[PDB]
RNA sequence: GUGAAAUACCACCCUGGCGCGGCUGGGGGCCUAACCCUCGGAUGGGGGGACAGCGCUUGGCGGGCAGUUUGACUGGGGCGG
């Protein structure tokens, strides 16, 4: 852990829960990268991956453009693009792919479908945030 | 590049571990002051001691007791059927 991270996670809270349009203006500032950042928001998933009847995939494309699947640990990963679009074209876009993801929920998925969501980068720290 | 997986700063997760803390269940030891026993004497001393005893509750063992059941046919009834 370098010092770019020492002022990264000192400037943001994994302690305090946040919302999605509140924390989406902080997405380009908290990446100190030397180049080429791509922003990744993540969610833990409320399904049992050992049951393949609960599995999901497809190709659905973001409104903006470049520039979703469940693994055997039952969590979520997906690229939305390249750094590109600024805070207000992201907070605008930050509700776009999530609600497009909720439409894949298998029936036998027991419990809260999106367990916890931290907005982060490939370059950046943990921020408690709400998909809402 | 002879394994399909890429060996970066990252979160999101699995799996176990310890670390702190929040809620916590469980054990041991010591104490005394409730409670108990005792003390020619006591607003006290000694002994036991949060046990025991007692309340409410759980499940159990339980002829020591209680209420009862223990069929009809039948060349008498039972036995047999
Ligand atoms: Mg003692
Ligand atoms: Mg005394
Ligand atoms: Mg005493
Ligand atoms: Mg007691
Ligand atoms: Mg009996
Ligand atoms: Mg009797
Ligand atoms: Mg009677
Ligand atoms: Mg008879
Ligand atoms: Mg006859
Ligand atoms: Mg006769
Ligand atoms: Mg007879
Ligand atoms: Mg008979």
Q: What is the largest CA-CA distance in chain A?
A: 45
CATH code (residue A89): 3.30.190.20
Q: Is residue A22 part of a domain?
A: yes
Residue A39: closest CA among A122, A125, A127: A122
Q: Is residue A109 part of a domain?
A: yes
Residue linked to tokens 């693994």 = A71
Q: Is residue A46 part of a domain?
A: yes
Spatial CB neighbours of A2, under 8 Å, sequence gap ≥ 6: none
Q: Is residue A41 part of a domain?
A: yes
Q: Is residue A6 part of a domain?
A: no
Q: Is residue A23 part of a domain?
A: yes
Give the residue numbers spanning the domain of A44: 13-64+68-132
Q: Running DSSP on this structure, what letter comes out for residue A4? A: H
Q: Distances in Å between the alpha carbon of A115 and those of A1, A93, A95?
A: 27, 21, 16
The alpha carbon torsion through A64, A70, A74, A79 (nearest 10 deg) reads -30
This structure's resolution (angstroms)?
3.0
Dist CA A119 CA A125 (whole Å): 8
Residues in chain A followed by a break, C to N above 2.5 angstroms: 67
Q: Quote the number of domains for chain A.
A: 1
Q: Is residue A8 part of a domain?
A: no
Phi, psi angles (nearest 5°) of residue A75: -130, 180
Would you tell me which residues have their CB within 7 A of strand B? A 1-2, 4-5, 8-9, 14, 33, 40, 42-44, 73-77, 115-116, 118, 120-126
CA–C1' distance A128–B20 (Å)?
21
Dist CA A115 CA A131 (whole Å): 10
CA–C1' distance A48–B9 (Å)?
31
Q: Is residue A3 part of a domain?
A: no
Dist CA A99 CA A131 (whole Å): 9
CA–C1' distance A34–B8 (Å)?
12
């Amino acid at each position: 852990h370098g010092k770019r991270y020492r002022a990264l996670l000192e400037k943001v809270d994994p302690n305090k829960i946040y919302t999605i349009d509140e924390a989406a203006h902080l997405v380009k500032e908290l990446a100190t990268a030397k180049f080429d950042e791509t922003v990744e928001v993540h969610a833990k998933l409320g399904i049992d991956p050992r049951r393949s009847d609960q599995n999901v995939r497809g190709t659905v494309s973001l409104p903006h453009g470049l520039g979703f699947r469940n693994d055997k640990t039952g969590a979520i990963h997906a690229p939305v693009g390249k750094a590109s679009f600024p805070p207000e074209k992201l907070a605008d876009n930050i509700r776009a792919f999530i609600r497009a993801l909720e439409a894949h929920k298998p029936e036998g998925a027991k419990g809260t479908f999106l367990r916890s969501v931290y907005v982060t980068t490939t370059m950046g720290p943990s921020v408690r945030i709400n998909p809402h």
